[PDB]
Design a protein around this ligand. Structure first.
Ligand SMILES: Nc1ncnc2c1ncn2[C@@H]1O[C@H](COP(=O)(O)OP(=O)(O)OP(=O)(O)O)[C@@H](O)[C@H]1O
Ligand SMILES: [Mg+2]
Lengths: 391, 310, 324
């Protein structure tokens, strides 16, 4: 068996790679000394490069990733060596070698656990360099780069500097321009990146990202209002990074919907102490979408109501409360008042009306189940809710 | 001693597929006056038969196999052929006449005529023009069904047909029906462009394509003010066939198919019925007038003039 | 992705490389994402055209080095993007002025189409519905004759070109191959049967109207005799990004076109050419594989083109005007 793998490796080093890869992985000391040959080969090829050796490098990277996946101090050394050998070849600029190297680095980094202090400056600069020049790339290179970024963010938890996310959510960042791809896979990986960034336990590094997202949403909303011949609003969550910018109608709508969908990472959390609460942001800050934007752009209103309903249904509509308990001592009243005001309107859409009715029915059925919610029938919001239901 | 004459169960053939008159509808006609005539026009797969059936004596919850007007079957779509041939006839209990129509300039008829003028190509165009003129001179209203927006060739055809019509001029109302609409087409921004294009493309059509059948007042758009549109033409959109939080359905962005169908039917039935000729006509009189008009259109002179030009 | 006029004026990296010219044309409905842009992006597998970005005609050119293929997209009054602008301009700034305006627009579109029909290797026509308008049969019939009255003038301007011998005689590299692309549009393996029926109907209609003949020289275009030339794009969630985003939010809260084109591109890229003649006596068909500079040398001369306006004014609203 020691020499049997040599023939398979030689054959695979030449669409059939999946079969040999699976066979080798299912087939299974010697690997420790065997990886040295590949490492030396890559180093020698990189040194001699300074252009037909690219296919060989790609094949070697693929076989190396397959053998390592078939399966604690040399991991950092090997990772640094691979990163240096990959970054050295900065002349040919081949997409195959870059994709293979990205996959190899991702699996190597994922092999360990986020319980060490490995060198992060090299990985961060490598990811940023690859992202800064991945605009007009192939459909696979973009996905590989995004996956690598997600893995890097997840691996480095609470240790990522604020500058990492500060330059990642700015208009000049290419990440914001990668979500416009027509393929659903690109949008999915982009959303995954946003989810991973927003799923951090470090409040100081997450506050800047949250503020940047809110600023972008405010800029898009202001652009829509200006294009609809109406004054701007939501000046309490504006950002300096988006002081002067232009967003098209379709672009603004897409950006607002994407940000609202991305906010579900923190909105649907299972227990994040930020200044603008998600509930207050979707119930009081974004109150202009129901005045005039609900007629020309009902999608934004529907998305806001849907995310608010999804966030409230996971906490039993905040009935027990009516630290966390004291902070949410006035949520049911606000929900009832909002439902009553929205239902009493006469300029609602079919989808919006159906969603509001479903929410109202769920809240009502909920009201009488307890025998302890009797005092909740005297507050004025309940009267407004009943009036809306009757009207 | 006042029971109705009879009830029609299925539509009949008013004109044979060979462009021949079929006098077989007098058995269901009376001597009453103030009759309404509705006609339809469109391409091959627009869905004129389904619309006519749903608007005359059918419901969306019913089945397509029992419709008053035969619809295209699944086995026919794969072959790329047409279903409706000639002109149909059907009258509801409210004494409302409905007239169907075969596709105009459809490749199915052309292919069927290949294995059967200078070339067998202008014949289809002339048949379409004949049907359009006939529907424009003996019908109270004509509904144009379009599969997609802005074909750019239907407007020219309509103008040419009205220019070669047989004959203080009478011009029936024109309705623009956009079948198989999507969410993107149910936005005010797109609606303004649609109305603007329709108005600019038919500035000198002489037809009554505005001032009636305004979907804006039919509660379709709750908060859309009437002044938001420079000129609201008669255009209607028909969409495609259609613990508690997890059961919420998908977001379509457009009203229900049944609601829009019912609204369209009500608006069509509540339309005006202006006089056709310079005298009052009854059901039997209208039938005879239509027969005479068709006979005159067949052996007309303008058609020959247009024929020698192709 | 630059304008054709802005490309001929201006190469060293690909001064001499065998390429294939592919023309794209047809109608397009009123939508945010046009069919041509999506087609180019899908074929090139990259975002060539980024999302959210007197006369009413335009010709765009794009080169692909990874595949060595040039694409020429055509936009005219047929597309809704240009029609909307034309209507908006006409709204602000008589029964006789509008007719002349539309006639001029149609003539310009016809001239552009004729230009594309003589400097392209493979061309494809798109449509928003499965059914194809028979009006095209007449358009082509009114286009072929037009080139017959312009061919002597075109060969005079490209006489001093390194294109070759057959190019100077036929004013074209080789008989272009036309492809048809339709969309499901909610209709309906049934796809194969529908495609075969559409191909048979198109072939019969074109043969009856004398548009397609046995000889592959006199005819302006031909179709394959044993391969597939009709593709139907199935429905997908790519269109209307708002709907896709909403679906993703809801989920979180709880052959092929490429192969269809390479099947024909591999023939021209291998210098084999095309051979479509079943008139009981086929004859060889001229074919050439020029380079970048070699193709531009003739494209610029053909695009720069006295008597063209006079010849184009003799050729549709002409019938309606005459009848009126
Ligand atoms: N709004 C719609 N939504 C979904 N399917 C539809 C719609 N309208 C029509 N269809 C279907 O598409 C096809 C359209 O053909 P249909 O029988 O309605 O008439 P048609 O296209 O006018 O026919 P003909 O070929 O005789 O002109 C049918 O199979 C019908 O069931
Ligand atoms: Mg029918």
């Amino acid at each position: 068996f020691s020499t049997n793998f040599r023939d398979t490796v030689d054959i695979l080093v030449g669409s059939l790679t999946q079969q040999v890869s699976g066979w080798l992985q299912s087939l299974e000391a010697f690997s420790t000394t065997l990886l040295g040959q590949f490492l030396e080969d890559m180093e020698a090829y990189a040194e001699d490069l300074s252009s037909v050796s690219l296919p060989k490098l790609a094949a070697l990277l693929r076989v190396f990733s397959t053998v390592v996946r078939s399966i604690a101090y040399v991991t950092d050394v090997l990772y640094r060596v691979m990163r240096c050998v990959t970054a050295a070849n900065q002349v040919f600029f081949s997409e195959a070698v870059l994709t293979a190297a990205n996959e190899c680095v991702g699996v190597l980094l994922g092999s360990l656990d986020p319980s060490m202090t490995i060198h992060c400056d090299m990985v961060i600069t490598y990811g940023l360099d690859q992202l800064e020049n991945c605009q007009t790339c192939g459909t696979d290179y973009i996905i590989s780069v995004l996956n690598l970024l997600t893995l890097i963010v997840e691996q480095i938890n609470t240790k990522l500097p604020s500058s990492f996310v500060e330059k990642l959510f700015i208009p000049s960042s290419k990440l914001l321009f990668l979500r416009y791809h027509k393929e659903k896979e690109v949008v999915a990986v982009a959303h995954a990146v946003y989810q991973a960034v927003l799923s951090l336990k470090n409040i100081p590094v997450l506050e800047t990202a949250y503020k940047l997202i809110l600023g972008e949403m405010t800029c898009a909303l202001n652009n829509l209002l200006h294009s609809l011949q109406l004054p701007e609003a939501c000046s309490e969550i504006k950002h300096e990074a988006f002081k002067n910018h232009v967003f098209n109608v379709d672009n603004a709508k897409f950006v607002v919907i994407f940000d609202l969908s991305a906010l579900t990472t923190i909105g649907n959390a299972k227990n994040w102490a930020l200044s603008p609460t998600v509930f207050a942001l979707l119930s009081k800050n974004l109150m202009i979408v129901h005045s005039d934007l609900a007629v020309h752009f009902p999608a934004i209103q529907y998305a806001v109501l849907y995310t608010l309903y999804s966030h409230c249904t996971r906490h039993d509509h905040f009935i027990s409360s009516s630290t966390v308990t004291t902070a949410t001592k006035k949520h049911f009243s606000i929900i009832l008042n909002l439902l009553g005001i929205l239902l009493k309107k006469d300029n609602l859409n079919q989808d919006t009306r159906k969603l509001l009715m479903t929410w109202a029915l769920e809240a009502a059925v909920l009201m009488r189940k307890s025998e302890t919610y009797a005092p909740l029938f005297s507050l004025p919001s309940f009267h407004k809710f009943c009036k809306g239901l009757l009207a | 001693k006042l029971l109705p004459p009879e009830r029609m169960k299925h539509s009949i053939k008013l004109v044979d597929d060979q462009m021949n008159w079929c006098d077989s509808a007098i058995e269901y006609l009376l001597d009453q006056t103030d009759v309404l005539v509705v006609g339809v026009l469109g391409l091959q797969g627009t869905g004129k038969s389904m619309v006519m059936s749903l608007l005359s004596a059918n419901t969306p919850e019913e089945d397509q196999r029992t419709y008053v007007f035969r619809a295209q079957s699944a086995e026919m779509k794969e072959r790329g052929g047409n279903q409706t041939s000639g002109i149909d006839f059907f009258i509801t209990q409210e004494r409302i006449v409905f007239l169907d129509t075969q596709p105009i300039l459809s490749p199915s008829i052309l292919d069927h005529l290949i294995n059967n003028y200078n070339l067998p190509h202008t014949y289809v165009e002339m048949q379409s023009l004949q049907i359009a003129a006939f529907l424009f001179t003996v019908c109270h209203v004509v509904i144009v069904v379009q599969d997609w927006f802005t074909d750019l060739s239907l407007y020219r055809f309509l103008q040419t047909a009205e220019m070669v019509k047989p004959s203080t001029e009478y011009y029936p109302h024109l309705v623009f029906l956009q079948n198989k609409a999507r969410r993107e087409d149910f936005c005010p921004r797109k609606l303004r462009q649609m109305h603007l294009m329709i108005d600019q493309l038919m500035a000198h059509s002489h037809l009554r394509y505005k001032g009636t059948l305004s979907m804006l007042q039919c509660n379709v758009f709750p908060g859309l003010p009437p002044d938001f549109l420079d000129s609201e033409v008669n255009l209607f959109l028909v969409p495609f066939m259609d613990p508690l939080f997890s059961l919420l359905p998908g977001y379509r962005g457009h009203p229900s198919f049944q609601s829009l169908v019912s609204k369209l039917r009500s608006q069509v039935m509540s339309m005006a019925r202006p006089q056709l000729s310079h005298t009052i006509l009854t059901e039997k009189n209208w039938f005879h007038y239509a027969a005479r008009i068709w006979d005159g259109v067949r052996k007309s002179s303008a058609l020959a003039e247009y024929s020698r030009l192709l | 992705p630059v304008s054709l006029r802005d490309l001929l004026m201006g190469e060293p990296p690909w001064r001499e490389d065998e390429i294939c010219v592919v023309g794209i044309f047809g109608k397009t409905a009123l939508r945010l994402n046009s069919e041509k842009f999506s087609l180019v992006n899908t074929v090139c597998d990259r975002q060539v055209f980024p999302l959210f970005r007197q006369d009413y005609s335009l010709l765009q050119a794009y080169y692909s080095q990874e595949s060595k293929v040039l694409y020429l997209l055509l936009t005219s009054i047929c597309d809704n993007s240009q029609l909307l602008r034309a209507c908006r301009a006409l709204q602000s700034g008589p029964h006789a002025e509008a007719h002349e305006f539309w006639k001029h627009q149609e003539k310009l579109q016809c001239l552009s189409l004729l230009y594309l029909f003589s400097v392209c290797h493979i061309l494809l026509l798109v449509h928003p519905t499965c059914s194809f308008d028979i009006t095209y049969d007449r358009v082509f019939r009114a286009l072929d004759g037009l080139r017959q009255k312009v061919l002597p003038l075109l060969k005079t301007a490209i006489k001093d070109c390194p294109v070759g011998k057959d190019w100077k005689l036929n004013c074209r590299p080789c008989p272009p191959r036309l492809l048809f692309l339709f969309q499901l549009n909610g209709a309906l393996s049934p796809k194969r049967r529908l495609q075969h029926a559409l191909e048979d109907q198109i072939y019969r209609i074109f043969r009856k109207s004398r548009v397609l003949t046995n000889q592959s020289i006199n005819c302006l275009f031909t179709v394959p005799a044993n391969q597939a030339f009709v593709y139907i794009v199935p429905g997908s969630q790519e269109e209307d990004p708002v709907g896709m985003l909403l679906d993703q939010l809801r989920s979180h809260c709880t052959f092929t076109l490429r192969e269809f084109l390479w099947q024909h591109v591999e023939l021209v890229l291998s210098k084999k050419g095309f051979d479509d003649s079943v008139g009981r006596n086929p004859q060889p068909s001229h074919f050439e594989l020029p380079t970048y500079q070699k193709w531009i040398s003739a494209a610029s001369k053909l695009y720069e083109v006295s008597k063209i306006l006079s010849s184009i004014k003799v050729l549709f609203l002409d019938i309606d005007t005459k009848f009126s």
